Structure 1
Amino acid sequence: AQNPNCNIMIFHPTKEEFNDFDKYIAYMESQGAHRAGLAKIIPPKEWKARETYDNISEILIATPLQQVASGRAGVFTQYHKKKKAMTVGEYRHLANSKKYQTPPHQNFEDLERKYWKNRIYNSPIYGADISGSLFDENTKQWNLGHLGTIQDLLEKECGVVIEGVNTPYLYFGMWKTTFAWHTEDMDLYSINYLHLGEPKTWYVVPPEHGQRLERLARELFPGSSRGCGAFLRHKVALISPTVLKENGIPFNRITQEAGEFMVTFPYGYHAGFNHGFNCAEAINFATPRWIDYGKMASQCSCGEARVTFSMDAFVRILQPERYDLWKRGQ
């Protein structure tokens, strides 16, 4: 068995290996990459996403989200308070202001310690989930706006056409902005490209151990767990690496830098934070191996988790017994 300890693997494809996206995902899995839940891909030196980032300041962040924490330093939830619209140029200036800028630090480990010590005492503002793309249309390799669609994958594997579209999203971050513990909708894959700026640190639980994280979360967030049997799908709960280690939860960590891709695999729980002003682009995708995960994925039906129009058909076709109850939740 490849990668039996479930370590995060790092890949360096050549320019020729970077041509066929599906083929390279399958290659990574043949080496055991999916057992970690997350892999890093460093593009060949000949590749570029676009020519420059000098002309992005007029993009609008229509609803910046202030991430307000409750709890204790290592076990907390966050809620999102909507703020007035601002451009990317205005957001970058805000991220770099004395109130929000990254503190002095010696290395990524020092900054990680500062994050877990001090995150709850501040409320950073995240420009998350903006529909759009920063890839140049002439970039033909690993262009997140030109991947095969999940709807076409389901049709190819199972035989019928479904409605729906999926397109990429942009995330403009600042110091301490946080993504909570979650798997993707319907336990899909995701791919994330860090276009510009300061790093993004990731934590991940191997898919084979995801239930261990779920059990700990129910113990640590007892009211939330009573309200919804899949409450991690609300994307609001944080648990620190120290607390995970105290409870014996298997996990790994890695820092992503500008110019690097991260792929999350089906049922790979992940969480993390931004080091400073940055911009990432992300999209969900599927492969033939995803189908059995989609068939078994848990659902939030309590009302909290977001309406995503494309998920309707995935539940309808893969989980017909659950569809009626799930639909009432939407």
Structure 2
Amino acid sequence: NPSARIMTFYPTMEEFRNFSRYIAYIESQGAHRAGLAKVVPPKEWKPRASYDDIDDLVIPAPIQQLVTGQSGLFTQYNIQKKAMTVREFRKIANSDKYCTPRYSEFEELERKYWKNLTFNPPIYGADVNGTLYEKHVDEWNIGRLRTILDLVEKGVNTPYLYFGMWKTSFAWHTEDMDLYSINYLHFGEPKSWYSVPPEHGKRLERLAKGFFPGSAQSCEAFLRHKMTLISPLMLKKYGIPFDKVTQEAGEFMITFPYGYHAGFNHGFNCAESTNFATRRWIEYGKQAVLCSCRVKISMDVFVRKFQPERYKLWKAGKDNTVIDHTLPTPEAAEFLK
């Protein structure tokens, strides 16, 4: 993948059955170079039979997202609201005040998103501790991915739900500890995404530091606050390489270590997310620039199990390793030959 473009995968039931193995395969194809990838599950596969029974589910901390800014540069302020049900949320999402505008092409809804993001602050039913997967579903269960991340246990290994409405957005960020993430769109309107290849993440970081010097002087890793919104036109103007994709109901999105992403919701929808790891991530986690002011994992456990050679060297602070973002996960051995 020398273009480092967002790749889409259509695994067959046999390919899909093993998660970490498929993640290894996609990586062998160079999916990780984009920072983001799309996986379409086999037609037969459904994580839940019906999403009709979830009306009385509680969103405990709804956030009214207030955006301030101009000419492609913005800051999102999350005003916590009183707990509400999925029924209360769906009624607001679909109301004449908060419903999706009329549009033809996606290019139109995007244009409208970046014009109106500062007006009529929507509510986002974000970071809801729970799962919509049924107990019995073994393939790609966000609640139990059984990645090397489980070594921490031996609360970022838990799943979170997101109830979105038109114009609700997520700011530019990599995952905490520069981890991988899985995002499944359970039902509803699409979710649009923007991605910066990990090989260019430092150019986005540099750009963001230039625009928000107050923020940068206050916290080294200020993008981790998940408050910074940057227009694709601003990225294009400052020559930051990026790509866009639209995830539709019943699709999976994978974010890779140090793969900056941001996006917005088209209308009323629900998506489940969690973090996961591969052997590749261990150097990403060790090297990660964290938020000072303000999720932190002690790498020691991983460096003792997978890098025993470099353990005494790293503990000392002599492990001068340099991350190659083009390199696939060791696990992709069986798929690279």
TM-score under structure 1 length normalisation: 0.89
Q: Deviations over 1:182-220 (max 9, x none)?
A: 000100000000001000000000001100000000111
Q: Paired residue for 1:136? A: 134
Q: Paired residue for 2:249? A: 258
1:149 deviates by 4.9
Distance of 1:164 and 1:281 partners within structure 2: 15
1:314 deviates by 4.0
Q: 2:298 aligns with which of 313, 325, 328?
A: 313
- Pairing 1:51-130 to 2, within 5 Å after superposition: 51-130=49-128
Q: 1:285 aligns with which of 265, 276, 283?
A: 276
TM-score under structure 2 length normalisation: 0.87
1:152 deviates by 3.4
Q: 1:211 aligns with which of 202, 227, 246?
A: 202
Mapped contact 1:163–1:313 kept (Cα < 8 A): no
1:73 deviates by 4.7
Distance of 1:147 and 1:275 partners within structure 2: 28
Matched, 1:190 2:181: yes
Distance of 1:315 and 1:183 partners within structure 2: 22
Q: CA RMSD in A?
A: 1.8
Q: Deviations over 1:289-308 (max 9, x none)?
A: 110111110011123xxxx4
Query: Cα–Cα, structure 1 residues 257 and 315, in superposed 2: closer, same or farther, change >3 Å?
Result: farther
Distance of 1:72 and 1:163 partners within structure 2: 47
User: Which amino acid in structure 2 is aligned with residue 313 of structure 1?
Assistant: S
Distance of 2:75 and 2:64 partners within structure 1: 13
Q: Paired residue for 1:302? A: 293
Mapped contact 2:151–2:301 kept (Cα < 8 A): no
Which structure 2 segments of 5+ residues have no match?
Answer: 304-313, 318-337
1:64 deviates by 0.6
User: Which amino acid in structure 2 is aligned with residue 139 of structure 1?
Assistant: V
Mapped contact 1:73–1:120 kept (Cα < 8 A): no
User: Which amino acid in structure 1 is aligned with residue 108 of structure 2?
Assistant: D
1:238 deviates by 0.4
1:131 deviates by 0.6
Distance of 2:264 and 2:156 partners within structure 1: 28
Query: Cα–Cα, structure 1 residues 194 and 315, in superposed 2: closer, same or farther, change >3 Å?
Result: farther
SS at match of 1:17: helix
User: Which amino acid in structure 1 is aligned with residue 257 of structure 2?
Assistant: P
Query: Cα–Cα, structure 1 residues 315 and 297, in superposed 2: closer, same or farther, change >3 Å?
Result: farther
Q: Deviations over 1:243-299 (max 9, x none)?
A: 000000000000000000000000000000000000000000001111011111001
1:69 deviates by 1.0
Q: Paired residue for 1:180? A: 171
1:91 deviates by 0.3
Distance of 2:16 and 2:236 partners within structure 1: 37
Mapped contact 2:173–2:262 kept (Cα < 8 A): yes
Mapped contact 1:184–1:266 kept (Cα < 8 A): yes
1:39 deviates by 0.5
User: Which amino acid in structure 1 is aligned with residue 125 of structure 2?
Assistant: G
SS at match of 1:193: strand
1:320 deviates by 6.3
Query: Cα–Cα, structure 1 residues 235 and 320, in superposed 2: closer, same or farther, change >3 Å?
Result: farther
Q: Paired residue for 1:224? A: 215
Alignment length, in residue pairs? 307
Aligned-pair identity (%):
65
Distance of 2:94 and 2:269 partners within structure 1: 11
Q: 1:23 aligns with which of 8, 18, 21?
A: 21
